[PDB]
Amino acid sequence: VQLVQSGAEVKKPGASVKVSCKASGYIFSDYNIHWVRQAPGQGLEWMGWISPDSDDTNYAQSFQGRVTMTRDTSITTVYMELSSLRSDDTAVYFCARSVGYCSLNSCQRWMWFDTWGQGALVTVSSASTKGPSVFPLAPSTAALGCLVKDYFPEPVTVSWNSGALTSGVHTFPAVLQSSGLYSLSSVVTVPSSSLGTQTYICNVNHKPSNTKVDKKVEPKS
Amino acid sequence: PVLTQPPSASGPPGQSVSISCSGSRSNIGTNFVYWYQQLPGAAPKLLIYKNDQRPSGVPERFFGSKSGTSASLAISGLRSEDEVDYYCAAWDDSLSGHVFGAGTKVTVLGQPKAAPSVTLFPPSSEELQANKATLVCLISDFYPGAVTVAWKADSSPVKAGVETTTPSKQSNNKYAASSYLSLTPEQWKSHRSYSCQVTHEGSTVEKTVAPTE
Amino acid sequence: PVLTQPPSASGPPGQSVSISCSGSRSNIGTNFVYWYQQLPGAAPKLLIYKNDQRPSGVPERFFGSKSGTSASLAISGLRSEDEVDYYCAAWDDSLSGHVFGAGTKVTVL
Question: What is the rounded end-to-end Cα distance, in angstroms, of chain C?
């Protein structure tokens, strides 16, 4: 059993997102598939089951027209069409593998969720993939580093000395800004005898914008 | 109704602990209770099904059972190399769907405190060139975490959208945290002394860095 | 108090070059020096203000700086579409008016 898929791309509120996981190694005519999301700091919620045999899928009480389910037998993969994403949708998406089969409303107490693997992530977003316009950060043993801003979405990778330095490189967690931006911080430790003599640069790569910014930090004048 | 579950748990290693999941009349007993466990940065996995049959793939180490209102998941001993939240799930006839519990943290049981070190990073002239000014200070080499970082201009605190990031776990047995603050260049040069302080539950240090060099 | 500005600038493309706009006593340093531009037969625009901030709508090529009495304008790269007529502008407290030099004409070598 496997559930290998691709990561979900960030979508604006009032739009549509698609999450689908590959099914192989078994026939897709007996297992009803479930969709569920991992809400942070609390429990999980359910909306309905998907049956690939007959047109008998139902809906939950709190999810009437939020989700629309379409089936396919040639590729044996369920397809996603979400509508009107909101701020409570900030969760990762996992396709729940359920054993057995059940249609009526007194046979679902016997089954259990079987397989979880390589889930995707769909969350609503006001801020959108923007090109970074980052500037070098002046330094203050001694410490120095560069900060990333005006970028979307998470995460980004900061490498020092063209990847030849890996000691002390920790990715500090970002914060949920009011304008929707983030800030990943990476710092390195140098002796105080060398602060403005040796050239230090950091490389930040941005995936959806295909931009590479090489900035050199300098002391404040 | 919504299934509720202990937020966390305190159990020393080498001795058995259990997790309780209080429910209702139509959710527990008349319906089977399933226990989900998920690794950090990975996919979840079922621990016990139908409260008496163990899944294949795990040795005879855990135990789960139900007794009336609450269902008990006996954890015979605890290893410090694996700390995994446990989820509580059941089924209700009135709700006609799956409802899930809050989840419980498990922790081992004390170490002495460390000496925190804080640094301040004023922006360069390039950041001020775009008619903006932001300030960042970082705290590291402190154990344990649960720290709060606030800015201070040595005369009066400023609250222009002060934020503090959550502490994170590093690979060298230490915690780290950072704080961010963005202002205007006019108010940036109004004060010639900026600093941020940390609360290490008994230790407080001030990093006085002038915005000159 | 008259601003001294060269009439022609010999700026070769491909490498950086700096020009100097010097004035007189109590003319530069007591007040900031402003950089402006205008197309031949079109309305003038703003290039650099206060020698500290780069305005929006202008590419980040001209570097605004001032060191002592002489005002230095630094550039990074030359293009055929950026051959606009630069000018030197300053405020004088002993004149109560803006001071303008001769104006620089840039020709591609």
Answer: 32
